[PDB]
Structure 1
Amino acid sequence: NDLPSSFTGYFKKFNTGRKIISQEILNLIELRMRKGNIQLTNSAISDALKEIDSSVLNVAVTGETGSGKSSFINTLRGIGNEEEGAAKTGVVEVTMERHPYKHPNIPNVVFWDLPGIGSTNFPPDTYLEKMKFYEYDFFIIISATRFKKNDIDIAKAISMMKKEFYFVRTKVDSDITNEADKEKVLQDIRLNCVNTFRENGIAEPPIFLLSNKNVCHYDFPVLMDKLISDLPIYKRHNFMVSLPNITDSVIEKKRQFLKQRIWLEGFAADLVNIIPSLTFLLDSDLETLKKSMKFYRTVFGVDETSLQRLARDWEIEVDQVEAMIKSPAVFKPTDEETIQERLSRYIQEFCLANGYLLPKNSFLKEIFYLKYYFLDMVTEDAKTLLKEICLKLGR
């Protein structure tokens, strides 16, 4: 129940697949805290954060023309082929150049649309050299059918360089519709794929059947979860926040990663022995808080632009969508109450329901309790809209 134990003890609420930082680093930080190395302690936390924040992810998306590379890239960034930044889909024209696509709101996440190896006449290894294989964190190998020798030869060349790769079977929704009017058409699809793999001399590998048109369906959710799990721990945060907000589970998962960063950031800023009251609101902390709110809102898809997007799909005024959630009104000017009074209330509300999160008389600085409050609010808003977005589908 001492401070060092409370610091590491906080991460016990998140399982190994949801850790933003390794147990070895946490133990090392706790050791330094217990040894009294205040310098080394803040240095280790600060370095951990810098490594988390600066992590850049480069995903290589390959597969033959028509597989769904461009669509996959759009789907992962949560954008339509129409939106700006989209990787145009249905492009048949041959190309020999890789094309980068950054997540619209997370610059540190970059997807590379690589031309199918078949489109080029490059042998597996030359293809990888030409595509600069060394720049990628992992490869997504897409097939809309049952995979072919080219896909496996690329994977074999990738494993030989000890890089991660995932076999993704797209268009399952097509096979389902074409074989109907759901059913285990998936079972057969997966079966044909395994035969192709066994056929190419390898043990049955993991296969993700999915539809770029329905991110909430099939193996898309487990794939996104597996990508995060397999990623070196420090890279998880940045990629996790860029992922599609498909279910309450994924939303909660984003919240868990964000809560851990607030905690690290809070300890890095130094704890205090004064209760959080926000008697005064510095303009600097106010600007920081406004930036945190905008970031959280963007991450969970409840930012201005996103709410505007929903204002389209739903033939209603943006004002009405905003009325459905809470985060949009936090910084909306009002003559009836100052921002300081509002944030002071939030802190009191937060600490009453959550406590101070630390041993008696130890507290995080006020701005962090506000970040936690903002995070819960936005995550709630996200679940609210998602509830409507999905159920309103009907298909």
Structure 2
Amino acid sequence: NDLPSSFTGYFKKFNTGRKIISQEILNLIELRMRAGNIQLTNSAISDALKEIDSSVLNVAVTGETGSGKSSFINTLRGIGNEEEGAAKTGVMERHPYKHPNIPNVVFWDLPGIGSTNFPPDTYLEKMKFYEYDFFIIISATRFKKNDIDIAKAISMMKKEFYFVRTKVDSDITNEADGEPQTFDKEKVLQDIRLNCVNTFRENGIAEPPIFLLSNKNVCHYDFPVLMDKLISDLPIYKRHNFMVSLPNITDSVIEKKRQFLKQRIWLEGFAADLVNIIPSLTFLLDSDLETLKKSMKFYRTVFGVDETSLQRLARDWEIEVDQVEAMIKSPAVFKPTDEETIQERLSRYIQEFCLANGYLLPKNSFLKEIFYLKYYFLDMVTEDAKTLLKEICLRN
């Protein structure tokens, strides 16, 4: 029940594909912790956090004009095609588009090779191939020789690529229009997937990743599967930043985000050093109070329950933003009030969190109060995200 073991034991409670950093790195930290040199130990923990936090992801998106590159980029960033910062949908060189909340996630819109006079290899060099983590090759219909050859070149250069077939919703709508209930919409998808794969393999790509989706319905088709696969292919430490940037499409995705964020709080908490003082004994320092307000804003944005996200959703709904906010809890925490009231409010949350969850550590050891409060806000915001998801699905 010693501290070093408790530190690593926390992470061991999460499933493999849900750990924030390699268990191997964590076990070395455990070793250093046992050594007792807090100087070196804190430094090692801070280094782990820095690697996670500093991770930058550069995603290349290529394909013919009109295939849906701009839309795909806006969808993953959670931005409407008509909002600012959004890649303008509609008919040069590459253009970057950073995620609005996670600047370290950058999508690059590349001009389709077909619009250039360059062979696959020259095209990739011109587009600064080595700057990307992976490539997304998009087509709204069938994949032409151009697209396929780029894929082969990328593969030959030892980088990952993914084929994304957009506008599948349009195919289903047009084929099903006026047809009896018996029309098989699922079969349309199954046929397109198999046909694409046969074509890819016929052309020399043995294991072509293919995803059929619609930029107008991120919750359906292969979008969820694509997100899981992209995260799975990334080095462990790079997953956190990309994960928190993803659209909050399912309870599973929301829960996965929470799991990653819980681990970051744990790391951050140990980096600040544990104490022997019970967390609910005193009020908070003003600096910690300000940090918590920033933390709440970040969590709300990550989970899509921030002001801007709420406005965007309820624009045309029968219930406006104020009605939507009334259905959740996080928006009320920091409504304007005096400093005493907010201090008293948080001093109660801390007692309640610890009475329900314990101190998460061996007897007499505690994280500084602010971290238990981050867990409290995280749970609150997570629950709000699920509540809102249900409301979104009923209406859109």
Decide: shared fold, TM above 0.5: yes
Partner of 2:22: 22
Partners of 1:310 and 1:321 within 8 A in 2: no
Percent of aligned pairs sharing the same letter? 99
Measured in 2, the distance between the counterparts of 1:350 and 1:72 equals 40
Measured in 2, the distance between the counterparts of 1:12 and 1:44 equals 19
Measured in 1, the distance between the counterparts of 2:40 and 2:277 equals 25
Partners of 1:158 and 1:165 within 8 A in 2: yes
TM-score by length of 2: 0.95
Deviation at 1:313, TM superposition (A): 2.7
Q: SS in structure 1 opposite 2:98?
A: strand
Measured in 1, the distance between the counterparts of 2:24 and 2:151 equals 32
Measured in 2, the distance between the counterparts of 1:335 and 1:141 equals 53
Measured in 2, the distance between the counterparts of 1:330 and 1:14 equals 29
Deviation at 1:336, TM superposition (A): 11
Q: Per-residue CA shift, 1:29-87, capped at 9, x if unaligned?
A: 11111222322221111001111111111100011222211111011001111111111
Measured in 2, the distance between the counterparts of 1:192 and 1:224 equals 22
Deviation at 1:337, TM superposition (A): 6.7
Gaps of 5+ in 2: 177-183
> Root-mean-square deviation (CA), in Å?
1.6
Q: Per-residue CA shift, 1:268-315, capped at 9, x if unaligned?
A: 000011111152221100100000000001111111111222331324
Deviation at 1:204, TM superposition (A): 4.0
Deviation at 1:98, TM superposition (A): 0.3
Partners of 2:167 and 2:215 within 8 A in 1: yes
Q: SS in structure 2 opposite 1:61?
A: strand
Q: SS in structure 2 opposite 1:13?
A: coil
Single out whichever of 46-55 and 146-155 deviates more from structure 2: 146-155
Measured in 2, the distance between the counterparts of 1:347 and 1:196 equals 59
Partner of 2:190: 187
Q: Alpha carbons of 1:43 and 1:335: their partners in 2 closer, same or farther (altered >3 Å)? A: closer
Measured in 2, the distance between the counterparts of 1:317 and 1:211 equals 27
Q: Alpha carbons of 1:278 and 1:105: their partners in 2 closer, same or farther (altered >3 Å)? A: farther
**Match for residue 201 of structure 1 among 200, 204, 211:** 204
Measured in 2, the distance between the counterparts of 1:145 and 1:192 equals 11
Partners of 2:152 and 2:205 within 8 A in 1: no
Partners of 1:146 and 1:196 within 8 A in 2: no
Partners of 1:96 and 1:115 within 8 A in 2: yes
Q: Alpha carbons of 1:7 and 1:154: their partners in 2 closer, same or farther (altered >3 Å)? A: same
- After TM superposition, the structure 1 = structure 2 runs for residues 242-253 of structure 1, keeping only pairs within 5 Å, are 242-253=245-256
TM-score by length of 1: 0.95
Deviation at 1:168, TM superposition (A): 1.1
Partners of 1:62 and 1:140 within 8 A in 2: yes
Partners of 2:201 and 2:208 within 8 A in 1: no
Deviation at 1:102, TM superposition (A): 0.9
Q: Per-residue CA shift, 1:194-236, capped at 9, x if unaligned?
A: 1211221221422111111110001100111111111111211
Q: Per-residue CA shift, 1:141-200, capped at 9, x if unaligned?
A: 112223122112111111122111111111111111122193210111012101211221
Q: SS in structure 2 opposite 1:100?
A: strand
Measured in 2, the distance between the counterparts of 1:332 and 1:202 equals 56
Q: Per-residue CA shift, 1:76-129, capped at 9, x if unaligned?
A: 001111111111113xxxx93001111122211110000111011111111111
Deviation at 1:243, TM superposition (A): 0.6
Deviation at 1:332, TM superposition (A): 0.9
Partner of 2:134: 138
Measured in 2, the distance between the counterparts of 1:367 and 1:384 equals 26
Measured in 1, the distance between the counterparts of 2:382 and 2:235 equals 25
Measured in 2, the distance between the counterparts of 1:83 and 1:162 equals 36
Deviation at 1:139, TM superposition (A): 0.6
Q: SS in structure 1 opposite 2:104?
A: strand
